[PDB]
Amino acid sequence: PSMSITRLFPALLECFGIVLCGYIAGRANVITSTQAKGLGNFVSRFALPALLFKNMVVLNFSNVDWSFLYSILIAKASVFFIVCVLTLLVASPDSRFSKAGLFPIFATQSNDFALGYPIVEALYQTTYPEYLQYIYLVAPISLMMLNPIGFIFCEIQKWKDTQNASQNKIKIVGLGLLRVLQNPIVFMVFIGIAFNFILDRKVPVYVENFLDGLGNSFSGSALFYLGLTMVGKIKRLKKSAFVVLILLITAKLLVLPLLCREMVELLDKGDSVVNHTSLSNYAFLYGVFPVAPGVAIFATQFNMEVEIITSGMVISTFVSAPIMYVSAWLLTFPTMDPKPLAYAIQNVSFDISIVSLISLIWSLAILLLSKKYKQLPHMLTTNLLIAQSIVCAGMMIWNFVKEKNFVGQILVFVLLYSSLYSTYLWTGLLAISLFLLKKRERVQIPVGIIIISGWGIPALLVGVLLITGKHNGDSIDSAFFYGKEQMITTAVTLFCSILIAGISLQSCILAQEEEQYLQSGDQQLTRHVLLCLLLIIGLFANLSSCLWWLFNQEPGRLYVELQFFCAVFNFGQGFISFGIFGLSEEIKMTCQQFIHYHRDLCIRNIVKERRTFCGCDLVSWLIEVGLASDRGEAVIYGDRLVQGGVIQHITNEYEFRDEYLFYRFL
Amino acid sequence: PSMSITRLFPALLECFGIVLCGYIAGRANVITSTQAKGLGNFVSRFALPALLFKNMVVLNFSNVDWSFLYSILIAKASVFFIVCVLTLLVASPDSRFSKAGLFPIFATQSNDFALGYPIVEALYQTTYPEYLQYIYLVAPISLMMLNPIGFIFCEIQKWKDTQNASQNKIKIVGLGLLRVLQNPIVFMVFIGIAFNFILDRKVPVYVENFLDGLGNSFSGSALFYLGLTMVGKIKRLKKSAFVVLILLITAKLLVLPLLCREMVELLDKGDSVVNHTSLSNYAFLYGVFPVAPGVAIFATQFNMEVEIITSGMVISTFVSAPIMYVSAWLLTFPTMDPKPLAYAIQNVSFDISIVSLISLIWSLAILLLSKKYKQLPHMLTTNLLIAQSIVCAGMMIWNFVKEKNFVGQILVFVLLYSSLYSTYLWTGLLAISLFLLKKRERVQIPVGIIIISGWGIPALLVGVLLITGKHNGDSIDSAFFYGKEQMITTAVTLFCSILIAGISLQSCILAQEEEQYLQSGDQQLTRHVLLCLLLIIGLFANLSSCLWWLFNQEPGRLYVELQFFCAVFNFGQGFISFGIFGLSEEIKMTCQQFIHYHRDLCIRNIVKERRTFCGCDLVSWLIEVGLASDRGEAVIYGDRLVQGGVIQHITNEYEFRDEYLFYRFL
Ligand SMILES: CC(C)CCC[C@@H](C)[C@H]1CC[C@H]2[C@@H]3CC=C4C[C@@H](OC(=O)CCC(=O)O)CC[C@]4(C)[C@H]3CC[C@]12C
Ligand SMILES: CC(C)CCC[C@@H](C)[C@H]1CC[C@H]2[C@@H]3CC=C4C[C@@H](OC(=O)CCC(=O)O)CC[C@]4(C)[C@H]3CC[C@]12C
Ligand SMILES: CC(C)CCC[C@@H](C)[C@H]1CC[C@H]2[C@@H]3CC=C4C[C@@H](O)CC[C@]4(C)[C@H]3CC[C@]12C
Ligand SMILES: CC(C)CCC[C@@H](C)[C@H]1CC[C@H]2[C@@H]3CC=C4C[C@@H](O)CC[C@]4(C)[C@H]3CC[C@]12C
């Protein structure tokens, strides 16, 4: 009925595929950091103002439900107040106010013009068209209400830092209000209100096409720019910063949706209980939008807490999508029957499985063409991705052979759950390999023994399940294909894997040292330990669901959520693996420019005699001088120099890269 | 009926308003030339491929009329062959091939993805939707048939710089084909055809939203980027280059549409004569699309004929719009009745007049706030724009009061045509002032006498016309309000104006020197002659139409076109006048970056002792060193330096500008 949910997955695919395209373009150095400024300016100064003005001139303010806006504003104000009070009472006095100026803003301001609006449009287009108008009502008002307090706190921190006690509160409040008044959203909305009243809710035909043309290009360009602005933002941090970031993202993505739902339940007291449920669900879905990059822009402008804010915004952007999908499906579940419920679970798992299969075959092609799996622990990772691809393919076959052929059904079930148990066990084997590498022991690794164990133990478990179990062809879900025996063998396999994971966790000298450094750096322990920390979340979810079903024989109103979560993890675990292990005239001009003018003073610190400069030191020196903005521009400049015959590698085998590679002048 | 024409003006307004926004953003240094590369890459590598693939997957090749495509291709091939043959026969042997490789491409390839498609969509969405599919069929194929040959010619020019007569024809053809195969349009269309046949003309729902999101952001972004790429392109050229440019634009915008119409007349031999007429009228206005910037990109890549190609592309882009509008209206005219025809003329003139009044009041406000009209010849220009604004307002009043009141309509007519005669005379007075300034005589200019004459002679003419004329209130057009006497007065006024126009055409010394330079440069004599010529063109058109009506008393089937042209010029002459007249952590980082490392060697060539460097020399030196790409980067860098307390003006009154203003170090 309401909240058509089958249209949400393509909308999420749009929203995050454009972001992924932007990230890939930025990271492959197609677009550098300087060239992204043009796209950012076009999006912020011409497309968003046009979209806001066009949508705000026609709003019909006499037919707007203000209860929803009041509830959302009350929830946001409550979250802001709580975060500000806790930050003031907890943070150290040296940089207290700055935190209280930005942490509440981080946990309240969301990204709903670029990401939230397509989702809301897809969910509520033909069912509740009046909901799409609320976004343009809620996003600006919040900036009109909560941003000034944060800006005032930041100005107070700046005043303390400068120690200019002669200032008064009037100037601080004036600066705080002026910073929020100059935002294009605020005054564009004000002008939209003014022209809405002047023009009697009608857009002249002369400017309709112009406004539509500028407004239709906002969403995709903003998604691309958001993807571009995440190329190098996530960096290593400390434990305290990590805990603060986890708390902030939990406040943004968990506490706020629940508070919005509670406020909508309290304030709204209308008839048509169906509409009340729809409004509460809409509030919950609105609460889960990620943090807007405008907060990072504010932090950069104030030059305070920029790194933690940027990292948190980037992380929350990616964390929000599974939360959105699962929350929407869970809220749609109550208005369903058990057989359509199972069909919906099958369909969602099939969609996740097919997208994950495409991503996994792409990642496998990359890994095979890299030809780096011959040394540990890349081949175990290759086996893990192979098992994930096989389980995705097995489920896609199962969705069609569920009630088509018998022998095909048994064969598909065997393949699918052998692959599932293979992934479960391979998590533990990878953890064991990482722990063994941690011991730094120069002992041979039984690669053959571990691989045959990992690919034969699940086969033996499936065989004994077939021998001792009872077939049940009336079950739509493959989890209950046999029943008690399948459940107990899955539970014991998960328990063993989790226990294993927990227990486990002209210069020859220059050439030899650089190849030794390359060999040492090829062992990417960070990514492997990240994967062998992330998989146990889903392993724990699976084990908890199995134990809950075993202990609670009578099905309560919690096993459906566990089924959905475990299926989503089981058939989307390949996304994590893809995210980890898946990613002339001007030449002459720059050549003579470098040779003639500033060639001198270059060889003073970065070049020394060796029995002749690195790759990182030259990039750092170029950044220091001012010939580049980031590492990308330095890499492009070095490529320009090398292609022109200015410098060359010693071995004549590597191009200009930001590694520990040595080059010589010509 | 067919070809809904009342909604073409908003489409043109959108298409060129986004271009104007891009040009203003680029010229005001909001977006620098380096930062535009990101927008260009996003447009050319992600949005256009997505749009092309999405449109090519669903095309229904079994229901496509190939006669239109064949006729367009034949006309384009004929134009290409003619231009190539004439260029080969006429051009000097120094660069005979290079021009022959680029001139036929300039006159054939058009801009139909960004500009042509919105126009075709607006004109034909409701009446003939199938026409919308022809663009994506015509634009790619043309390249596949015409781009190689020309490219081969360019390769021959490169072969003329190698002095290797033996080798290699095969290599030349291979390079020519490889340059056209790597264009995203070509292989995107090929992949679209392949997936069209694979997918049975159906796109999966998973990628529908992604393709729609990337494809919907192409038109506005491409228009903005096109506007951005026209900031510093039009430059002074030679007479021969000007003649070649005029010939090339005439071939592109005049010969090609007529040839397309003729080929469609010859080949298409179908039924439903109305459909044949509509398809032949669609053949026309396809050849009036301006030159695509891809030709300029090709010229830059080949590094040959770059300046003439860029200037011609920009000029054709700006010239095509009135040609499109007038051609479409003239083609639509035959399917109308006399009274609806007159109403359509009134409506088109009213629309042009209202847009021109908005533009003119903007320009007048800018000129008044500039406070530079106190010296000749700016105040005469101010009077000219005042008269144009008054005539626009008078016509907008007339359209509402054409049949409302007697005294009101008489007063409105008097004001309107007094303003029209005022503009006609003020053209000649501006010509007289320019000629007097050319004589370089230090004689006082009777500004009061000339302004009194210019604002009084039209009043005397309209008064004597009212006294001796006869009222005719049954005419919708204001031209025949009185009859033959009004035509005689208009003709004699135009003849007098045309004759007049034709007949006429520390810091002791540095401060005064720069003041004298500013005074000399304030008299912008370069643009005034161009404005005079542009108004003379329309005055000549008006006089020709008046003489044609006077000599040809019986109305043939040519007076409607002259009426339309006269109305368009009379009520859009303000657009010409608007075009001529009307258009920190980083700080400290850059200031100590300049101070610490490369502060030295700056005072070696440009800075010298004076009784101390101009901004132009600093900009040129910064460009030469490599710290800036164009004048914009140098200007931004100088602003950063000045705001950081590095250099300051002698008078401390001028910010960092690319003028002859001396600056001193701190
Ligand atoms: C939730 C399901 C059912 C719907 C489909 C969601 C996917 C389209 C999302 C989910 C996880 C996303 C990924 C999560 C994390 C990343 C890493 C991200 O890069 C970084 O975070 C690196 C930053 C740096 O190096 O500074 C690039 C996008 C990517 C691959 C994302 C691409 C889009 C993905 C696959
Ligand atoms: C034809 C009518 C009925 C429809 C509306 C058309 C307008 C939207 C067009 C027609 C003429 C155009 C102008 C023609 C020329 C210019 C100059 C152009 O700048 C340059 O050419 C300078 C280039 C340089 O300095 O290098 C900026 C856009 C502008 C004002 C154009 C803006 C858009 C205009 C007013
Ligand atoms: C359950 C399935 C369907 C979806 C899982 C989504 C979440 C849990 C996964 C999908 C891809 C993952 C990301 C993949 C790659 C990276 C880059 C790394 O440097 C930090 C972690 C990070 C950012 C991961 C965080 C967790 C992540 C966002
Ligand atoms: C008849 C009315 C309605 C429309 C007239 C359109 C044409 C003829 C006019 C409108 C604005 C004009 C432009 C205004 C400004 C400039 C900049 C100048 O450095 C070169 C000429 C150029 C580029 C003009 C060329 C002619 C132009 C394009």
Side-chain angles (χ1 to χ4, degrees), chain A residues 10 13-14 17-18 21 25 30-31 34-35 37-39 41-42 46 205-206 209-210 216-217 224 351 593 597-598 624, chain B residues 10 13-14 17-18 21 30-31 35 37-39 41 46 205-206 209-210 213 216 221 224 351 593 597 623-626:
Chain A
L13 268 189
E14 176 186 1
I18 305 178
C21 285
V30 175
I31 313 179
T34 306
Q35 322 182 352
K37 282 156 164 201
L39 190 48
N41 289 318
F42 164 66
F46 292 94
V205 311
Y206 299 125
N209 283 52
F210 175 78
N216 279 343
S217 55
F224 198 89
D351 295 324
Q593 265 181 357
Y597 302 100
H598 48 283
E624 190 182 3
Chain B
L13 268 189
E14 164 201 0
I18 305 178
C21 285
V30 175
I31 310 185
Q35 312 174 7
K37 285 169 165 61
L39 191 47
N41 289 317
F46 295 93
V205 304
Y206 297 126
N209 284 51
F210 176 77
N216 274 347
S221 305
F224 199 89
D351 292 337
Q593 265 183 358
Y597 301 98
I623 283 294
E624 180 187 0
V625 171

Coordinates of all heavy atoms in Angstrom, one line a residue, chain A residues 10 13-14 17-18 21 25 30-31 34-35 37-39 41-42 46 205-206 209-210 216-217 224 351 593 597-598 624, chain B residues 10 13-14 17-18 21 30-31 35 37-39 41 46 205-206 209-210 213 216 221 224 351 593 597 623-626:
Chain A
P10 N 16.7 0.9 -6.5 CA 17.3 1.7 -7.6 C 17.6 3.1 -7.3 O 18.6 3.6 -7.8 CB 16.1 1.6 -8.7 CG 15.4 0.4 -8.3 CD 15.4 0.3 -6.9
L13 N 20.9 3.0 -5.5 CA 21.9 2.7 -6.6 C 22.3 3.9 -7.3 O 23.4 4.2 -7.5 CB 21.4 1.6 -7.5 CG 21.7 0.1 -7.1 CD1 21.3 -0.8 -8.3 CD2 23.2 0.0 -6.8
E14 N 21.3 4.7 -7.8 CA 21.6 6.0 -8.3 C 22.4 6.9 -7.4 O 23.5 7.3 -7.8 CB 20.3 6.7 -8.6 CG 20.4 8.1 -9.2 CD 19.1 8.9 -9.3 OE1 18.1 8.3 -9.0 OE2 19.2 10.1 -9.7
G17 N 25.9 5.3 -6.7 CA 26.7 5.0 -7.9 C 27.3 6.3 -8.5 O 28.4 6.4 -8.9
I18 N 26.5 7.4 -8.4 CA 27.1 8.7 -8.8 C 28.2 9.2 -7.9 O 29.2 9.7 -8.3 CB 26.0 9.8 -9.0 CG1 24.9 9.3 -9.9 CG2 26.6 11.1 -9.5 CD1 23.7 10.3 -10.1
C21 N 31.2 7.1 -8.8 CA 31.8 7.6 -10.0 C 32.7 8.8 -9.7 O 33.8 9.0 -10.2 CB 30.7 7.9 -11.0 SG 30.0 6.5 -11.9
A25 N 36.7 9.0 -10.2 CA 37.3 10.1 -11.0 C 38.3 10.9 -10.3 O 39.4 11.2 -10.8 CB 36.2 11.0 -11.6
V30 N 41.8 11.9 -12.6 CA 41.1 12.5 -13.8 C 40.7 14.0 -13.5 O 41.0 14.9 -14.3 CB 39.8 11.7 -14.1 CG1 39.0 12.4 -15.3 CG2 40.2 10.3 -14.5
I31 N 40.2 14.2 -12.3 CA 39.9 15.6 -11.8 C 40.7 15.8 -10.5 O 40.6 15.0 -9.6 CB 38.4 15.8 -11.6 CG1 37.6 15.3 -12.8 CG2 38.1 17.3 -11.3 CD1 36.1 15.4 -12.6
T34 N 42.0 21.2 -7.4 CA 41.7 22.5 -7.9 C 40.5 22.5 -8.9 O 39.7 23.4 -8.9 CB 42.9 23.1 -8.5 OG1 44.0 23.1 -7.6 CG2 42.7 24.6 -8.9
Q35 N 40.5 21.5 -9.8 CA 39.5 21.5 -10.8 C 38.1 21.2 -10.3 O 37.1 21.4 -10.9 CB 39.8 20.5 -11.9 CG 41.3 20.5 -12.3 CD 41.7 19.5 -13.4 OE1 40.8 18.7 -13.8 NE2 42.9 19.6 -13.8
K37 N 36.9 22.7 -7.7 CA 36.3 23.9 -7.2 C 35.3 24.5 -8.2 O 34.3 25.1 -7.7 CB 37.4 24.9 -7.0 CG 38.2 24.6 -5.7 CD 39.6 25.2 -5.7 CE 40.2 25.3 -4.4 NZ 41.3 26.3 -4.3
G38 N 35.5 24.3 -9.5 CA 34.5 24.8 -10.4 C 33.2 24.1 -10.3 O 32.1 24.8 -10.3
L39 N 33.2 22.8 -10.2 CA 32.0 22.0 -10.0 C 31.3 22.4 -8.7 O 30.1 22.6 -8.6 CB 32.3 20.5 -10.1 CG 31.1 19.6 -10.2 CD1 30.1 20.1 -11.2 CD2 31.5 18.2 -10.4
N41 N 31.5 25.3 -7.1 CA 30.9 26.6 -7.2 C 29.7 26.6 -8.0 O 28.7 27.3 -7.7 CB 32.0 27.6 -7.8 CG 33.1 27.9 -6.9 OD1 32.9 28.1 -5.7 ND2 34.3 27.9 -7.4
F42 N 29.7 25.9 -9.2 CA 28.5 25.8 -10.0 C 27.3 25.2 -9.2 O 26.2 25.6 -9.3 CB 28.8 24.9 -11.2 CG 27.5 24.5 -12.0 CD1 26.7 25.4 -12.6 CD2 27.2 23.1 -12.0 CE1 25.6 25.0 -13.2 CE2 26.1 22.7 -12.7 CZ 25.3 23.6 -13.3
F46 N 24.7 28.3 -8.3 CA 23.8 28.5 -9.4 C 22.7 27.5 -9.5 O 21.6 27.9 -9.8 CB 24.6 28.5 -10.7 CG 25.5 29.7 -10.9 CD1 26.8 29.6 -10.5 CD2 25.0 30.9 -11.4 CE1 27.7 30.7 -10.6 CE2 25.9 32.0 -11.5 CZ 27.2 31.9 -11.1
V205 N 6.2 32.2 -17.6 CA 6.6 31.2 -18.6 C 8.0 31.6 -19.2 O 8.6 30.7 -19.8 CB 5.6 31.1 -19.7 CG1 4.2 30.9 -19.2 CG2 5.6 32.3 -20.6
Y206 N 8.4 32.8 -19.0 CA 9.7 33.3 -19.6 C 10.9 32.6 -18.8 O 11.9 32.2 -19.5 CB 9.8 34.8 -19.5 CG 8.8 35.5 -20.4 CD1 8.0 36.5 -19.8 CD2 8.6 35.2 -21.7 CE1 7.0 37.1 -20.5 CE2 7.7 35.9 -22.5 CZ 6.9 36.8 -21.9 OH 5.9 37.5 -22.6
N209 N 11.7 27.7 -18.1 CA 12.7 26.8 -18.7 C 14.0 27.1 -18.1 O 14.8 26.1 -17.8 CB 12.7 27.1 -20.2 CG 11.5 26.4 -20.9 OD1 10.4 26.6 -20.5 ND2 11.8 25.6 -21.9
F210 N 14.4 28.3 -17.8 CA 15.7 28.7 -17.2 C 15.8 28.1 -15.8 O 16.8 27.4 -15.5 CB 15.9 30.2 -17.2 CG 17.1 30.7 -16.5 CD1 18.3 30.6 -17.2 CD2 17.0 31.2 -15.3 CE1 19.5 31.1 -16.5 CE2 18.2 31.7 -14.6 CZ 19.4 31.6 -15.3
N216 N 17.5 21.1 -12.7 CA 17.6 19.7 -13.0 C 19.1 19.1 -13.0 O 19.2 17.9 -12.9 CB 17.1 19.4 -14.4 CG 15.6 19.3 -14.5 OD1 14.9 19.1 -13.4 ND2 15.0 19.5 -15.6
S217 N 20.1 20.0 -13.0 CA 21.4 19.6 -13.0 C 22.1 19.6 -11.6 O 23.2 19.3 -11.5 CB 22.3 20.5 -13.9 OG 22.1 21.8 -13.6
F224 N 28.2 13.9 -7.6 CA 29.6 13.7 -8.1 C 30.6 14.5 -7.3 O 31.7 14.0 -7.0 CB 29.6 14.2 -9.6 CG 30.8 13.6 -10.4 CD1 30.7 12.4 -11.0 CD2 31.9 14.4 -10.5 CE1 31.8 12.0 -11.7 CE2 33.0 13.9 -11.2 CZ 33.0 12.7 -11.8
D351 N 18.3 -9.2 -4.9 CA 18.9 -7.9 -5.5 C 20.3 -7.6 -4.9 O 21.2 -7.3 -5.7 CB 17.9 -6.8 -5.2 CG 16.6 -6.9 -5.9 OD1 16.6 -7.4 -7.0 OD2 15.6 -6.5 -5.3
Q593 N 59.9 25.8 -18.5 CA 59.7 26.6 -17.4 C 60.5 26.1 -16.2 O 61.0 26.9 -15.4 CB 58.2 26.6 -17.0 CG 57.4 27.8 -17.6 CD 55.9 27.7 -17.3 OE1 55.5 26.8 -16.6 NE2 55.2 28.7 -17.7
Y597 N 64.0 28.8 -15.2 CA 63.8 29.8 -14.2 C 64.2 29.3 -12.8 O 65.1 29.8 -12.1 CB 62.4 30.3 -14.2 CG 62.0 30.9 -15.6 CD1 61.3 30.2 -16.5 CD2 62.4 32.2 -15.9 CE1 61.0 30.8 -17.7 CE2 62.1 32.8 -17.1 CZ 61.4 32.0 -18.0 OH 61.1 32.6 -19.3
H598 N 63.5 28.2 -12.3 CA 63.7 27.7 -11.0 C 64.3 26.4 -10.9 O 64.1 25.6 -10.0 CB 62.3 27.7 -10.3 CG 61.2 27.1 -11.1 ND1 60.6 27.7 -12.1 CD2 60.6 25.8 -11.0 CE1 59.7 26.9 -12.6 NE2 59.7 25.8 -12.0
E624 N 55.7 22.3 -0.8 CA 56.2 23.3 0.1 C 56.5 24.6 -0.7 O 56.2 25.7 -0.2 CB 57.5 22.8 0.8 CG 58.0 23.7 1.9 CD 59.3 23.2 2.5 OE1 59.8 22.2 2.0 OE2 59.8 23.8 3.4
Chain B
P10 N 10.9 31.0 -24.6 CA 11.4 30.6 -23.3 C 12.6 29.6 -23.4 O 13.5 29.6 -22.6 CB 10.2 30.0 -22.7 CG 9.0 30.6 -23.3 CD 9.4 30.9 -24.7
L13 N 15.6 31.5 -24.2 CA 15.9 32.3 -22.9 C 16.7 31.4 -22.0 O 17.7 31.8 -21.4 CB 14.7 32.8 -22.3 CG 14.3 34.2 -22.7 CD1 13.1 34.7 -21.8 CD2 15.5 35.2 -22.6
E14 N 16.2 30.1 -21.8 CA 16.9 29.2 -20.9 C 18.3 28.9 -21.5 O 19.3 29.0 -20.8 CB 16.1 27.9 -20.9 CG 17.0 26.7 -20.4 CD 16.4 25.3 -20.8 OE1 15.3 25.3 -21.4 OE2 17.0 24.3 -20.4
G17 N 20.5 32.1 -21.3 CA 20.6 32.6 -19.9 C 21.6 31.7 -19.2 O 22.4 32.3 -18.4
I18 N 21.6 30.4 -19.3 CA 22.6 29.6 -18.7 C 24.0 29.9 -19.2 O 25.0 30.0 -18.4 CB 22.3 28.1 -18.8 CG1 20.8 27.9 -18.2 CG2 23.2 27.3 -18.0 CD1 20.4 26.4 -18.3
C21 N 25.1 33.2 -17.6 CA 25.5 32.9 -16.3 C 26.9 32.4 -16.2 O 27.7 32.8 -15.4 CB 24.5 32.0 -15.6 SG 22.9 32.7 -15.1
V30 N 34.8 34.3 -10.5 CA 34.2 33.3 -9.5 C 34.7 31.9 -9.8 O 35.1 31.2 -8.8 CB 32.7 33.4 -9.6 CG1 32.0 32.3 -8.7 CG2 32.1 34.8 -9.3
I31 N 34.8 31.5 -11.0 CA 35.3 30.2 -11.4 C 36.5 30.5 -12.4 O 36.3 31.2 -13.4 CB 34.3 29.3 -12.1 CG1 33.0 29.3 -11.3 CG2 34.9 27.9 -12.4 CD1 32.0 28.3 -11.8
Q35 N 39.8 25.8 -12.8 CA 38.7 25.2 -12.1 C 37.6 24.7 -13.0 O 36.7 23.9 -12.6 CB 38.1 26.1 -11.0 CG 39.2 26.7 -10.1 CD 38.7 27.7 -9.1 OE1 37.4 27.9 -9.0 NE2 39.6 28.4 -8.4
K37 N 38.1 23.0 -15.7 CA 38.4 21.7 -16.2 C 37.6 20.6 -15.6 O 37.3 19.6 -16.2 CB 39.9 21.5 -16.0 CG 40.8 22.3 -17.0 CD 42.3 22.2 -16.6 CE 43.1 22.7 -17.8 NZ 42.9 24.1 -18.1
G38 N 37.3 20.7 -14.3 CA 36.5 19.7 -13.6 C 35.1 19.6 -14.2 O 34.6 18.5 -14.4
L39 N 34.5 20.8 -14.4 CA 33.2 20.8 -15.0 C 33.2 20.2 -16.4 O 32.3 19.5 -16.8 CB 32.6 22.2 -15.0 CG 31.1 22.4 -15.3 CD1 30.3 21.4 -14.6 CD2 30.7 23.8 -15.0
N41 N 35.4 18.0 -17.7 CA 35.6 16.6 -17.6 C 34.3 15.9 -17.2 O 33.9 14.8 -17.7 CB 36.7 16.3 -16.6 CG 38.0 16.7 -17.2 OD1 38.3 16.4 -18.3 ND2 38.9 17.3 -16.3
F46 N 31.1 11.8 -18.2 CA 30.2 11.0 -17.4 C 28.7 11.3 -17.8 O 27.9 10.4 -17.8 CB 30.4 11.3 -15.9 CG 31.7 10.8 -15.4 CD1 32.8 11.6 -15.4 CD2 31.9 9.5 -15.0 CE1 34.1 11.2 -14.9 CE2 33.1 9.0 -14.5 CZ 34.2 9.9 -14.5
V205 N 15.6 -2.0 -14.5 CA 15.2 -1.0 -13.5 C 16.3 -0.6 -12.6 O 16.2 0.4 -11.9 CB 13.9 -1.5 -12.8 CG1 12.8 -1.8 -13.8 CG2 14.3 -2.7 -12.0
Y206 N 17.3 -1.5 -12.5 CA 18.4 -1.2 -11.5 C 19.2 0.0 -11.9 O 19.6 0.8 -11.1 CB 19.3 -2.4 -11.4 CG 18.6 -3.6 -10.8 CD1 18.6 -4.9 -11.5 CD2 17.9 -3.6 -9.6 CE1 18.0 -6.0 -11.0 CE2 17.3 -4.7 -9.1 CZ 17.3 -5.9 -9.8 OH 16.7 -7.0 -9.3
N209 N 17.5 4.7 -12.7 CA 17.7 5.9 -12.0 C 19.1 6.5 -12.1 O 19.3 7.7 -12.2 CB 17.4 5.6 -10.5 CG 15.9 5.5 -10.2 OD1 15.2 4.8 -10.9 ND2 15.4 6.2 -9.2
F210 N 20.1 5.6 -12.2 CA 21.5 6.0 -12.3 C 21.7 6.8 -13.7 O 22.3 7.8 -13.8 CB 22.4 4.8 -12.2 CG 23.9 5.1 -12.4 CD1 24.6 5.8 -11.5 CD2 24.5 4.8 -13.6 CE1 26.0 6.0 -11.7 CE2 25.8 5.0 -13.8 CZ 26.6 5.7 -12.9
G213 N 19.8 10.1 -13.7 CA 20.5 11.1 -12.8 C 21.7 11.6 -13.6 O 21.9 12.9 -13.5
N216 N 20.4 13.8 -16.8 CA 19.6 15.0 -16.5 C 20.5 16.2 -16.2 O 19.9 17.3 -16.2 CB 18.6 14.7 -15.4 CG 17.3 14.1 -15.9 OD1 17.1 14.0 -17.1 ND2 16.5 13.6 -15.0
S221 N 24.8 21.9 -17.3 CA 26.3 21.9 -17.0 C 27.0 22.3 -18.3 O 28.0 23.0 -18.3 CB 26.7 20.6 -16.4 OG 26.0 20.3 -15.3
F224 N 26.6 26.0 -19.1 CA 27.4 26.7 -18.2 C 28.9 26.7 -18.6 O 29.6 27.7 -18.6 CB 27.2 26.3 -16.7 CG 27.7 27.3 -15.7 CD1 26.8 28.2 -15.2 CD2 29.0 27.2 -15.2 CE1 27.2 29.1 -14.3 CE2 29.4 28.1 -14.2 CZ 28.5 29.1 -13.8
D351 N 7.4 40.5 -26.5 CA 8.3 39.7 -25.7 C 9.7 40.2 -25.8 O 10.4 40.4 -24.8 CB 8.2 38.3 -26.1 CG 6.9 37.6 -25.8 OD1 6.2 38.1 -24.9 OD2 6.6 36.6 -26.5
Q593 N 54.7 31.7 1.9 CA 55.3 31.0 0.8 C 56.0 31.8 -0.2 O 57.1 31.5 -0.7 CB 54.2 30.2 0.1 CG 54.0 28.8 0.6 CD 52.9 28.0 -0.2 OE1 52.3 28.5 -1.1 NE2 52.7 26.7 0.2
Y597 N 60.7 31.5 0.1 CA 61.5 30.7 -0.9 C 61.8 31.5 -2.1 O 63.0 31.7 -2.5 CB 60.7 29.4 -1.3 CG 60.4 28.5 -0.1 CD1 59.2 28.6 0.5 CD2 61.4 27.7 0.4 CE1 58.9 27.8 1.6 CE2 61.1 26.9 1.5 CZ 59.9 26.9 2.1 OH 59.7 26.1 3.2
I623 N 53.0 34.7 -14.9 CA 52.7 33.8 -15.9 C 53.9 33.1 -16.5 O 53.9 31.9 -16.7 CB 51.9 34.5 -17.0 CG1 50.4 34.7 -16.6 CG2 51.9 33.7 -18.3 CD1 49.6 33.4 -16.4
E624 N 55.0 33.9 -16.7 CA 56.2 33.4 -17.3 C 56.8 32.3 -16.4 O 57.3 31.3 -16.9 CB 57.2 34.5 -17.6 CG 58.5 34.1 -18.2 CD 59.5 35.2 -18.3 OE1 59.1 36.3 -17.9 OE2 60.6 35.0 -18.8
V625 N 56.9 32.6 -15.1 CA 57.5 31.7 -14.1 C 56.8 30.4 -14.1 O 57.4 29.3 -14.1 CB 57.6 32.3 -12.7 CG1 58.1 31.3 -11.7 CG2 58.6 33.5 -12.8
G626 N 55.4 30.4 -14.0 CA 54.6 29.2 -14.0 C 53.7 29.1 -12.8 O 53.2 28.1 -12.5

